[PDB]
Amino acid sequence: SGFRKMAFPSGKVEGCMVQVTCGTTTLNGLWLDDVVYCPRHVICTSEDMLNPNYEDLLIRKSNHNFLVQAGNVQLRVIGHSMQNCVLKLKVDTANPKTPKYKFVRIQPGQTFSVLACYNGSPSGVYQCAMRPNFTIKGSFLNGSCGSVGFNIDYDCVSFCYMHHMVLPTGVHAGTDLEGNFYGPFVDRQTAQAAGTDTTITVNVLAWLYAAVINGDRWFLNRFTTTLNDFNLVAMKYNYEPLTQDHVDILGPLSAQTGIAVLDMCASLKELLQNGMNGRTILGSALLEDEFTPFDVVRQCS
Amino acid sequence: SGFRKMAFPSGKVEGCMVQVTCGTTTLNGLWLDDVVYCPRHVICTSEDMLNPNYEDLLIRKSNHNFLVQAGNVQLRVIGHSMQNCVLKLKVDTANPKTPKYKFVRIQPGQTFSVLACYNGSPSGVYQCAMRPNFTIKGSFLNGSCGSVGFNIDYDCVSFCYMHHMVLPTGVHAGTDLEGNFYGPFVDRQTAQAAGTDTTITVNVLAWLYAAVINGDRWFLNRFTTTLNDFNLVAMKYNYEPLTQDHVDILGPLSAQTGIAVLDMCASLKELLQNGMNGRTILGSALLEDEFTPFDVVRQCS
């Protein structure tokens, strides 16, 4: 009953958050087994950000130039390397709170929980989504670098994101846990374009399905639409084109509500062209696109 | 950078979640020290909900009629009592994961994080607020009874809420950790009125202050307003009347943005009478009222 944008329980991730201090720069790290992961720009000063040569910058750094603080217990650094944009600091002591984990590169449109670490410690948790421009609309202040995005399958944590930078628009960019940036972004202080931020169409349909389950039906229309004609009005409104795969993913919601996928797309076409006229759907006046169909299925059962 | 409705890290609360099974009814409990707290309606069947005499119902129950499951370790019940609407089950083993905690009755308008326990285990976390009608707009399915609301001050957990029922409107009602319901609600299956759900005015002003800090200023107007004249247009739009205390709480945001409180109320008056004209503030077309001024201060520093 009721629909909320809830995140996974961050208990398994809080036990892996550490502080990495290189010189005067500090940020958060991920302590899994005997390796600490953090953005490689921790080794840069206020000047190096404009044009950093991370290879030349890391060469002048040694193992002892890294302060890894886990609450109060310091970790001895026995090795370091650079995998793309992530810094892998091998420590002596393995984390006893290491959960079952794996690394995964998340596709645009998929959601994940973010443990935002303000003021040098786990401070908040929220649910967000990977936008088509490979940016996220989150909440990151100074000291939030190293904040990780993750998903939890029963007992396994799927770490997928690590925050690095904020675009001049205010949106955020980051990498996966193997160092590769999501999008055409590079860890360097310079004006970078994000690109057109289209709307995840399959997530919007999943949110409309969640509205029917929760009682809101005013938007249910008396029309239908084909797949190509819906995509015609989709490109005009900066919506991603719907594919037959997206129809298959929305399978369980169509069978649970008795509303076919193409009928739901027909309704969505009317909301784009006519607006909501001030009305609300699930307490919002905007088509929400931060709910994957798997998130709706999880919460509605 | 960026504004999100983030919740506190639920790591300290997950270690206190247990399953309480009385007969065929199961729900979640709060294992603090050697006491387990849960809604007292766990002892009711499907029929007792219509007209329960909890005293007569609890008399026919003994210590062994309560299955307290903490993951896999069962807890031996050595005592039980009824404090208003909460069931205090004294167990033999004290919870080793018991954090520094205390109980607090939250005032309407204040926010707190909720660890929603779907399917018999901690499943999600979200931030919500106590509405003026003492209800909350959350996400609670069957088996969510026993889900707790809490706030975290550095190391101390302030447990303030426990979910019990859902109103026929879909909104949720609950009690504090001493058993007293928030509002005129009673644990009994019968049509109960929630009352007029006014808008927390001080929270809306705090959200507008957060919009100025984040760059959105289109709503900043060129007028001012007194306190009594703003309350005149406040009652018309189902907004709570602003008091001089509310002005004092908004102190830090006015001194940080250089915008006086009465000037911010002047802007808010224009949004109520003219709407947003389809525009957005912090990515929303509705005046958000689930951010206390302390939440904005926490996230904007």
Ligand SMILES: CC(C)(C)[C@H](NC(=O)C(F)(F)F)C(=O)N1C[C@H]2[C@@H]([C@H]1C(=O)N[C@H](C=N)C[C@@H]1CCNC1=O)C2(C)C
């Ligand atoms: C806009 C800015 C000029 C700051 C820059 N932006 C671009 O370079 C862009 F234009 F490409 F975005 C940027 O983000 N950084 C500068 C530099 C990293 C990152 C950075 O130091 N960030 C802060 C470090 N703790 C955390 C931020 C600050 C506020 N809130 C946060 O979370 C790197 C790209 C290597």
Ligand SMILES: CC(C)(C)[C@H](NC(=O)C(F)(F)F)C(=O)N1C[C@H]2[C@@H]([C@H]1C(=O)N[C@H](C=N)C[C@@H]1CCNC1=O)C2(C)C
């Ligand atoms: C609407 C209903 C008739 C169900 C009733 N409502 C009213 O009695 C009211 F009209 F007062 F609201 C109600 O909530 N309950 C019946 C009964 C308790 C509660 C209840 O058994 N709840 C479920 C138990 N696990 C969890 C719910 C179900 C869906 N999602 C949830 O979270 C008590 C008031 C003692």
